[PDB]
């Protein structure tokens, strides 16, 4: 489906677009990646269009490689999905969704430990990047956006730790 949201198909007015770059598996809705007009030929994501060392084109807000990336204001790269769920992250242009603006992200997002990384053999990565916090008031569980994404814990634009998600009646 889409690398950014949890919708598996596109819509006529918002198609699901597949990157044709070699080795790349990025697929995004037009609206999930800020694509202005849908391409008539092969389409390439910003990473595949990049001429940078591959080791460098990766999200600085989380430890997962690949996925749907845009350039940042500090000369780096970040996931669109990480940008959408860390509250203080912004975009210079919300239509094109780029560059991703990190200058207003506070210390508070960078001094946490991702509990999911800690559980999944990524202890060395748990205190890197930026974390969202569980939406339950009083809960101190913190986690990378993409770690929660893969765990099915993301939901405007918030998430829960596994425990509080388990305590919420699903409707
Ligand atoms: Zn999407
Ligand atoms: Zn690509
Ligand atoms: Zn990320
Ligand atoms: Zn994590
Ligand atoms: Zn919680």
From Swiss-Prot:
Changing residue 57 to A: Does not affect interaction with histone H3. Probably involved in transcriptional regulation. In vitro or as fusion protein with KMT2A/MLL1 has transactivation activity. Binds to cruciform DNA. In cells, binding to unmodified histone H3 regulates DOT1L functions including histone H3 'Lys-79' dimethylation (H3K79me2) and gene activation. It is found in: Nucleus. Residues 83-157 are annotated as: Required for interaction with histone H3. Self-associates. Interacts with FSTL3 isoform 2; the interaction enhances MLLT10 in vitro transcriptional activity and self-association. Interacts with YEATS4. Interacts with SS18. Interacts with DOT1L; this interaction also occurs with the KMT2A/MLL1 fusion protein. Interacts with histone H3; interaction is necessary for MLLT10 binding to nucleosomes; interaction is inhibited by histone H3 'Lys-27' methylations (H3K27me1, H3K27me2 and H3K27me3) amd acetylation; interaction stabilizes association of MLLT10 at chromatin; interaction is essential for histone H3 'Lys-79' dimethylation (H3K79me2). The chain holds residues 24 to 204 of 1068 of the full protein. Transmembrane segments: none annotated. It is linked to A chromosomal aberration involving MLLT10 is associated with acute leukemias. Translocation t(10;11)(p12;q23) with KMT2A/MLL1. The result is a rogue activator protein. A chromosomal aberration involving MLLT10 is associated with diffuse histiocytic lymphomas. Translocation t(10;11)(p13;q14) with PICALM. Changing residue 84 to A: Impairs interaction with histone H3. Reduces association to chromatin. Does not rescued histone H3 'Lys-79' dimethylation (H3K79me2) levels in MLLT10-depleted cells. Does not rescued DOT1L-target genes in MLLT10-depleted cells. Expressed abundantly in testis. A zinc finger (PHD-type) spans 1-51, 112-165. A zinc finger (C2HC pre-PHD-type) spans 56-89. This is Protein AF-10. Changing residue 157 to A: Impairs interaction with histone H3. Signal peptide: none annotated.
């Amino acid at each position: 489906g889409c690398c950014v949201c949890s919708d598996e198909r596109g819509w006529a007015e918002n198609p699901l677009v597949y990157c044709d770059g070699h080795g790349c598996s990025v697929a995004v809705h037009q609206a999930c990646y800020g694509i202005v007009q849908v391409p008539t030929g092969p389409w390439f994501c910003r990473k595949c269009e990049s001429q940078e060392r591959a080791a460098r084109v990766r999200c600085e807000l989380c430890p997962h490689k690949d996925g749907a990336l845009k350039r940042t204001d500090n000369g780096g790269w970040a996931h669109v999905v990480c940008a959408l769920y860390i509250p203080e992250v912004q975009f210079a242009n919300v239509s094109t969704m780029e560059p991703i603006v990190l200058q207003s992200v506070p210390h508070d997002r960078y001094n946490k430990t991702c509990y999911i990384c800690d559980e999944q053999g990524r202890e060395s990565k748990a205190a890197t990047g930026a974390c969202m916090t569980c939406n339950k008031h009083g809960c101190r569980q913190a986690f990378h956006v993409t770690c929660a994404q893969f765990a099915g814990l993301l939901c405007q634009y918030c998430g829960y730790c596994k425990y509080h998600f388990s305590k919420l009646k699903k409707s």
